[PDB]
Symmetry: C3
Subunit: 282 residues, 3 copies
């Protein structure tokens, strides 16, 4: 039912947005866990409901595309994201990222909620993604399956420096200088399609594969971003500590997941704002 | 593919079955290996073909139609699925989920499932019973989880935990019954990994799966278990080792016993 | 999903091909990486564009349709697929399966396949030939096995075993031919793992796959092999190591498809020679 994320359709969506706003964003932000309040901090802003943009995908009140300034820099913010466990298509998830590219986005910043596999992690820690394992992608559910859209990128994109090392370095430096570097780690994120939380046996396997955190999002958007030459910064908020033991009473509870996210939200938002402030300006 | 497994479609299918039978089942049973057994011993049985229920999914020909048998086993009301829906056959998520959600509406509190599996754990022999204490849902991790799509909130939550998925008290009781009846030497516990199939696993795949922490591998069960736990049905599951896996490229009978095991477990189950 | 690879449709395609050629192929060959020139050197060749065969699947290289090539190679009757069907392009299971099932009805007894792969095994070098002795079908272990759906009983059984999928006698012959002709040092045997693709593998993914016991990684071949084994065609498959997998993110080395193509172009002469000399010594005839 969704529109193909080709150059024709993506240009149509982008042109419609360009009539509603003159703001040319250079940073795109996808609000996951810990970024529920990010839209508040955006100054001189214009909120465009997804329902008001023809052929743009719809998610829930409607999601919004928010243009404005954050730490003196032009941004576009997705409030409302598209998870594959909801039944959305590859084209649906890809289109907004490709729209970002045509609008002028050079850097994508994204947060998500994740289970902490690594035993040294604490609840509410930040794990900057330095790499990923795209289990769906290895198993023939990669977002790029189908004809390649050459206007955007190449058939066989490499993912060697997917999580830009310079952005990771800066994020770590900002954290350390503002007194919460002890909460910040870097690690490998593995995608579980979802929507089930991971069993103890699954978590144990994933930890032994060299995974630090597990979640149900983000990798698809990262692949599309890298495919079209957008630099990527991504960070997992550890919203549950994974249970590896089948005889343990401990278990992931979604309300506790949301509570951890909201508790850390002011800090995560402050962190993002202070990273954007320090980004090189040309 | 078929009808959506939402609260209205599942309500309609359950309501028709309740006109064809007065038995309110407390235990659901899916026969994977011991099909010819277990469905015989049910006292006062009521064989209800899948074709006699509209919107209930139908097996693909083969000269053997599926049946939903109601009755009593060891002093308890039960409903037995004779004819499963496997993902390798091409059935949709809703098709596999619907029967389990019908069981919930019919009154089922415990689902007992058996299947055929390849042994990965090196201590296993052919004919061994392996009670599942956990699983690895490879298709689920790779974006083919049965719950993908809009959540039916009337059955369960968006993000179900799979803690104590294989109820530890039911496993404890199943072990007690086996050892009390002489065949405790056959019974193991372990992790079941789902291979979507329908190919049997290569030696290299078997080696990888073994090293992932998996004891047995098969092509069914996990999807139903996930739907069962989503809607709050307790699960007991057992694999019969029907093939021992070869690990390197260089290198029926238990139907009556597993039937007896299941009958005697139900005997000792606590009743509300 | 296109036309079903059932007995009726497959027969219709096979009969259309048999009107265009009098060559009854004994050996099928899918030209992957390194086999561009092998197709070129088929003797007395009849070339049939895929466009000219009703209900045969369509694939192009920037507009130019692939070809089915009939002829001989070292005196043995062959059918060569010049142009193949990768699942990352969005082709259905039936589309990938149909050509192989057509080969079965045409008379094919052995399928030979090459491909491009990343070298996970740390002893491998760029340009090495890795004969497949086993595989790990990650899409298959998920719910994307090429045989998912109603089984076409005409071609094979519901649950095919893959125990000797990569025929051990064909592997032994291939090694012997390499040894006797002075390039045995380039020839290895290993486990191939399918990444659905089309993204190259991340460092973390490669590390995981290596620790699973995988020697090379690629985005093709296993679906065809499964269909071949399902209908009883013996299989010989070889990966050309076209990239060395990077296992650490802290490294500027990356997989680029141009150098992958350069490795295939440079080893094509030797791989062609290898396949011709294997075919010369195959059993039955």
């Amino acid at each position: 039912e969704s529109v193909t994320a080709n150059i024709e359709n993506v240009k149509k969506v982008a042109h419609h947005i360009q009539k509603l706003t003159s703001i040319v964003p250079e940073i795109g932000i996808i609000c996951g866990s810990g970024l529920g309040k990010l839209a508040d901090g955006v100054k001189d802003k214009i909120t465009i409901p997804y329902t008001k943009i023809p052929n743009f995908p719809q998610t829930s009140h409607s999601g919004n595309l928010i243009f404005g300034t954050l730490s003196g820099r032009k941004v576009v913010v997705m409030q409302g994201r598209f998870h594959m466990y909801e039944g959305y298509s590859n084209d649906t998830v890809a289109l907004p990222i490709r729209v970002m590219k045509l609008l002028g986005v050079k850097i994508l910043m994204v947060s998500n909620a994740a289970g902490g596999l690594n035993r040294s992690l604490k609840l509410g820690d930040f794990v900057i993604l330095k790499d990923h394992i795209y289990l769906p992608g290895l198993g023939l559910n990669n977002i790029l399956v189908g004809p390649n859209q050459e206007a955007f990128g190449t058939r066989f994109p490499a993912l060697s420096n997917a999580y830009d090392r310079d952005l990771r370095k800066l994020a770590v430096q900002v954290a350390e200088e503002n007194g919460f570097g002890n909460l910040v780690h870097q690690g490998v994120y593995v995608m579980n399609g979802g929507p089930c939380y991971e069993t103890p046996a699954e978590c144990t396997m994933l930890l032994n594969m060299g995974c630090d955190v597990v979640g149900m999002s983000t990798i698809p958007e990262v692949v599309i971003a890298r495919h079209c030459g957008i630099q990527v910064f991504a960070v997992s908020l550890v919203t549950n500590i994974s249970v590896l033991d089948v005889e343990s009473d401990l278990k992931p509870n979604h309300e506790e997941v949301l509570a951890t996210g909201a508790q850390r939200a002011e800090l995560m938002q402050s962190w993002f704002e202070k990273i954007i402030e320090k980004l090189p300006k040309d």
